[PDB]
Amino acid sequence: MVLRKVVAILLAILPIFLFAVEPIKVVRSEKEIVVLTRFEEYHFDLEKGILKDFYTLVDGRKHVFTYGNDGFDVLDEGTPLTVIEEPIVTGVGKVSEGFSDEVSIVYNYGYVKKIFTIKNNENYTFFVDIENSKPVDVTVPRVSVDTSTDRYLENYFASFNPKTRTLVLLKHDEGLLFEGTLKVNGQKRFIVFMGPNKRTLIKKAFPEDYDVLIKALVNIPGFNKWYDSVFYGLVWFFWWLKDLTKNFGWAIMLFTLIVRLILYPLYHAQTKSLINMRKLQPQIEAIKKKYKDPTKQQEALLKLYREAGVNPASGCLMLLIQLPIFMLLWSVIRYYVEEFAYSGSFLIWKDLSAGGFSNNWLFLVITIVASYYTTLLTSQDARTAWQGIIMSVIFPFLFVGLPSGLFLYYATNTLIQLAVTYYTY
Amino acid sequence: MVLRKVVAILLAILPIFLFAVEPIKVVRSEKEIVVLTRFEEYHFDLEKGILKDFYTLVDGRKHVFTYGNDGFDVLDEGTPLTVIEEPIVTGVGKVSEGFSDEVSIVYNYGYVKKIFTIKNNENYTFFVDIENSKPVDVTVPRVSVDTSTDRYLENYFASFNPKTRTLVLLKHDEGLLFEGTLKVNGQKRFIVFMGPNKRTLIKKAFPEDYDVLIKALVNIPGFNKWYDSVFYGLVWFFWWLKDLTKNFGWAIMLFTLIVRLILYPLYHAQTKSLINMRKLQPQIEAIKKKYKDPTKQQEALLKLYREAGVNPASGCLMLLIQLPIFMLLWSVIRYYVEEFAYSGSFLIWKDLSAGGFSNNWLFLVITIVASYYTTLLTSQDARTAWQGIIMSVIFPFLFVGLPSGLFLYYATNTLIQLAVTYYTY
């Protein structure tokens, strides 16, 4: 039963706790109630029944919204209304400190129910459902410092804040007939987007009229930073790869393959310079214990070997064109963070947007063993014993705090290199 | 210069930042000044010039002392004195947030200097130096709830608190002539011990008359818990090993070797039961696709193989005698924590009292590759592919949060096992 308990009991429950996604930790409190996700965080008042303050967890906490008597104030003709009962927190999948699938919040006053639905999705969206017995008005939030950024669209209403790059965009049913607050009778479900202006997330948020919606959004001054053209070209490239290759880890691997393939010749060049070199290294030159030694005075080797049509500084050059590929891929990783956390896992790496030893420990050892065999063929001297150390053991250990995805790019590139270098003849 | 920068620049500075010991983070504040070490933590008042409160970091913060108008109150005939100037914080090796070799604190009133020296050693000791122009009295601290535990020794004075197992033991020069507070003229250096009653640390704290001092301390009721006899027998055994083998990592390895050596026969037994078994496994019994299959009804194998003089449940039994060896060694690790942090490092593992993946990542892979080859000889069937997984990959990953030392015990034991099992004939 030891073997049964390991293959079923300790094998069918290990991935459930391991890949356990973060729950919506709800915190009820006195004169406040707070709703926390992995990226989103909301401060709610339980007396007026409104959104007090709104933070942003990604890349440090960011206070991006403060109640400007606009955060869904149920008001009838200028004056707002208050509750007649406590709020109740409806949710889905009640976990100890808070639900883990969905969280609703029930505010009710006399004849009106303001329901705050918050799904545990990657988006920064949340629903404001509402019912009424007599017509009422409810305020709309805005993060824009001055009202030049806000745009009264046909069915939507944007409020962009270029300082924090925070966008308040909600969908209403009042086509173009918009007066400040939201006037409502009966019942209505409202879809709100509040967060950064990540176009991929907006596409998921409002895929019905996104193309009509993005044309307006681009023309907002400050929305489109200069680099967003190329940057988003690459972003949608990776969106197409993910929507071809089931997830992002593969998308990196093909991207690595693409990157190495599109600019191949270097391996020829870096080895042609090395073919003539690794053919004529100190053993073929046969000058090791020779005419002199340090107290620099090289005076022969460099100039005497500076006859063959080779390219010195081979391994030291690739880095200079590797930084742009690294920085481009890294910035893309910091763009898809929300997707990563909720888009399942690759194989063992639950999130590729995270670092530390606990994810990149296996990339590290794979790099080590792969580098070992690659570093075997090169340098027929005794540098290998010292050459295995410098590359594999030192630099990735220094750089082990990077997002796991970058180590996936690196490691895939190294497997390619090994298989590419492996052409024994 | 790439190779020079890796062998000297990025090789002679890597261990300095890596093995950087924790500094004494000093926190000056309004009407308080706090002195923090890796285990010790003191709250000082800068008006009366005394020790307000004393915590204990090891295994969670523990408030073990509160000012009972006894924490070094400079008083002349009942009434205490106050400062005439600010305190100054003298130290050694001024690092950004606080010194990292030694910290002194200068209180002065009129004619008396109370100096609080605090070394960055493993001990819970600190010095109270003092100078005076006219005789004065200074209070002595006590953590004992009631004054049955305190003992006026010849030169020392203990104040043990059995509830928290916290001992206040200081050395004075007044041989047996002790009246409450400390009466002093001229200048004197006082050696104070305040913390848990770890006998090894006391030996280092007062090695002059420790043997005379420990006889008194044992007879304090509550000091000696029943298990301290055996427990400290083992503790001083490890103290002797460390004082033979340069450090603790080796002391484990020999201890493992000792533990495996003192009770060897099992390998014979666990393999004799396995010799007859691994000789006559399903391939020699030659009954694999046979008379029946699950829907349990074993009915033959167990009873039909229950003729040879073997010992089934071989690999499952050792665990039961491994827990006591584990728990004994683990508890010892949690005893020497202070030593570990400041007693250098073994090879790569800077502290063996810590856990996580970042220290035991190399033990893990070494276990994996070592188990692989050990699991090769055993089980000539195709269980190995599944048998390598269960032991190496699963259980240590589950148990990867244990102190690194326990993984050193385990891994050393596994290397022994491999070399021991390796007797191909």
Identify the CA nearest to A134 among candidates A191, A77, A85: A77
- C-alpha B131/C-alpha B113 separation (Å) is 5
Q: Are A98 and A195 in contact (CB under 8 A)?
A: no
Chain B residues with beta carbon closer than 8 angstroms to that of A390? 3, 6-7
Size of chain A, expressed as the number of residues it contains: 425
Q: What are phi and psi of B179, to 5 degrees?
A: -130, 90
Residue of A nearest to B357 (CA): A358
Which method, experimentally, gave rise to this model? X-ray
Q: Number of helices (H) and strands (E) in chain B: give both, helices first.
A: 15, 17
Residue B357: which of A11, A361, A386 has the nearest Cβ?
Answer: A361
- C-alpha B274/C-alpha A304 separation (Å) is 67
- C-alpha A276/C-alpha A280 separation (Å) is 6
Residue of B nearest to A387 (CA): B3
Residue at A122: amino acid letter: E
Q: Which of left, alpha, beta for A222 (phi over 0: left; psi -120 to 50: alpha)?
A: left
Chain B residues with beta carbon closer than 8 angstroms to that of A6? 390, 394
β-bridge partners, B182: B138
3-class DSSP state of B94:
strand
Residue of A nearest to B361 (CA): A361
Residue with tokens 């605090």: B118
Using a CB–CB cut-off of 8 Å, the residues of B that contact A are 2-3, 6-7, 10-11, 14, 316, 356-358, 361, 364-365, 386, 390, 394, 398
Q: Per the CB < 8 Å rule, is A10 touching B394?
A: yes
Q: Per the CB < 8 Å rule, is B394 touching A7?
A: no
Cα angle value B411/B414/B419 (rounded, 5°): 130
For helices A314-333 and A228-245, the axis angle rounded to 10 degrees is: 80
For B342-378, letters b (16+ CB in 10 Å) and e give: eeebbeebbbbbbbebbbbbbbbbbbbebbeebbeeb
Q: Per the CB < 8 Å rule, is B6 touching A357?
A: no
Query: How far A254 CA sits from the closest chain B CA (Å)?
Result: 29
HSE value, Cβ hemisphere, 13 Å, CA-based, for B326: 15
Q: Per the CB < 8 Å rule, is B10 touching A394?
A: yes
Q: For chain B, how far is it from start to end, CA to CA, in angstroms? A: 52
Query: How far B318 CA sits from the closest chain A CA (Å)?
Result: 14
Domains of chain A: 21-223 (2.70.98), 238-421 (no CATH)
Chain B residues with beta carbon closer than 8 angstroms to that of A391? none
Torsion angle defined by CA atoms of residues B339, B340, B343 and B346, in that order, rounded to the nearest 10 degrees: 150
DSSP conformation class of B390: I
Q: Which two tokens stand for residue A251?
A: 């998308």
CB neighbourhood size of B412 (10 A): 21
Identify the CA nearest to B57 among candidates B74, B77, B35, B37: B37
- C-alpha B328/C-alpha B338 separation (Å) is 18
